[PDB]
Amino acid sequence: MENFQKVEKIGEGTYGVVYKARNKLTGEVVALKKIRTEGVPSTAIREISLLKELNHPNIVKLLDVIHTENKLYLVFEFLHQDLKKFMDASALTGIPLPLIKSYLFQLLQGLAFCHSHRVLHRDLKPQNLLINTEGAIKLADFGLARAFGVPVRTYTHEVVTLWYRAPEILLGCKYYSTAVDIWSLGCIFAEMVTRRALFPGDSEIDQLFRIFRTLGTPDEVVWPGVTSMPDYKPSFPKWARQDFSKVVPPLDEDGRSLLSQMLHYDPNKRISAKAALAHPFFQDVTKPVPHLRL
Ligand SMILES: Nc1ncnc2c1ncn2[C@@H]1O[C@H](COP(=O)(O)OP(=O)(O)OP(=O)(O)O)[C@@H](O)[C@H]1O
Numbered sequence: 001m002e003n004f005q006k007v008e009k010i011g012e013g014t015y016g017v018v019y020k021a022r023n024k025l026t027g028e029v030v031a032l033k034k035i036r037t038e039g040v041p042s043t044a045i046r047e048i049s050l051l052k053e054l055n056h057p058n059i060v061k062l063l064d065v066i067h068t069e070n071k072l073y074l075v076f077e078f079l080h081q082d083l084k085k086f087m088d089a090s091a092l093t094g095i096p097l098p099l100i101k102s103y104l105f106q107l108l109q110g111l112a113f114c115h116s117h118r119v120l121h122r123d124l125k126p127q128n129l130l131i132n133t134e135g136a137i138k139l140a141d142f143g144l145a146r147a148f149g150v151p152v153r154t155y156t157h158e159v160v161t162l163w164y165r166a167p168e169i170l171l172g173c174k175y176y177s178t179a180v181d182i183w184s185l186g187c188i189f190a191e192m193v194t195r196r197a198l199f200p201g202d203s204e205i206d207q208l209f210r211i212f213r214t215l216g217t218p219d220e221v222v223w224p225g226v227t228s229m230p231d232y233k234p235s236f237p238k239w240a241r242q243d244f245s246k247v248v249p250p251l252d253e254d255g256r257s258l259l260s261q262m263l264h265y266d267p268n269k270r271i272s273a274k275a276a277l278a279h280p281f282f283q284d285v286t287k288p289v290p291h292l293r294l
Pocket residue numbers: 010011012013014015016017018031060076077078079080081082123127128129130140141
């Protein structure tokens with residue numbers, strides 16, 4: 001755009017290309033997102049503008065929204081690294097637990113704030129979690145799924161990841177709640193600990209089955225109303241639940257107890273972000289500084 005000098009292309013997502021850019025009227029470096037044709041949905045533009053007012057220290061700030069020439073560009077504060085990159089960097093040594101506990105604690109603070117404002121993310125993944133050199137972590141793209149309605153292939157025909165998708169979304173549930181974000185966070189939490197994605201599905205059905213082989217095929221006892229879900233089939237194979245001690249070693253009792261609450265099949269049983277902040281797992285949380293290399 002005319003007021004921005006694009007420095008680099010940080011990447012491409014489901015919603016468009018992200019560029020590091022410098023504002024010429026301010027000199028500040030920002031993240032500019034060109035959003036992926038009738039002049040931009042008035043509904044979309046009103047949802048985004050709502051977000052401008054939702055400010056929290058653990059939420060990547062939406063600075064500006066620019067619908068010019070009937071085009072949408074979102075200007076966000078810029079953070080140097082995403083958690084995906086960070087994990088790939090700490091793969092041999094693992095992210096230390098005190099760092100894992102600080103990050104999860106901050107993510108829950110961010111979720112609890114958005115959730116109390118009835119704002120859901122619905123697309124949590126490591127690429128949407130940004131970190132700085134101070135030991136802070138922030139949620140990026142909060143609320144854009146609402147605004148634009150999540151696609152299958154990214155703006156650049158890249159297949160979108162289902163790994164963090166909650167089972168109710170996979171079973172065809174149209175009105176999902178804030179619990180969907182808790183499920184996603186649960187999956188990321190487990191990945192950070194083991195250094196391996198919990199449920200790396202490559203199709204909607206493969207995704208569902210990986211979840212089922214681990215947590216057991218849900219039934220009416222554990223998830224009331226599950227058998228009436230749109231995509232539920234009586235023909236689903238029946239798997240037993242695996243032991244969490246076998247799923248997430250070497251997480252202690254507190255961590256395992258917290259994770260199982262985050263991964264409850266029944267969305268209404270799933271722990272809220274605010275209740276998770278009080279879990280004994282956080283009894284000793286601190287704020288360590290990462291091992292960043294820019
Ligand atoms: N404010 C930001 N500052 C720095 N880099 C960012 C910022 N927003 C996103 N990025 C990075 O740019 C890349 C692309 O982001 P984008 O959000 O388009 O991709 P994605 O997060 O993997 O998928 P989706 O488009 O669904 O959110 C990823 O590294 C993301 O972490």
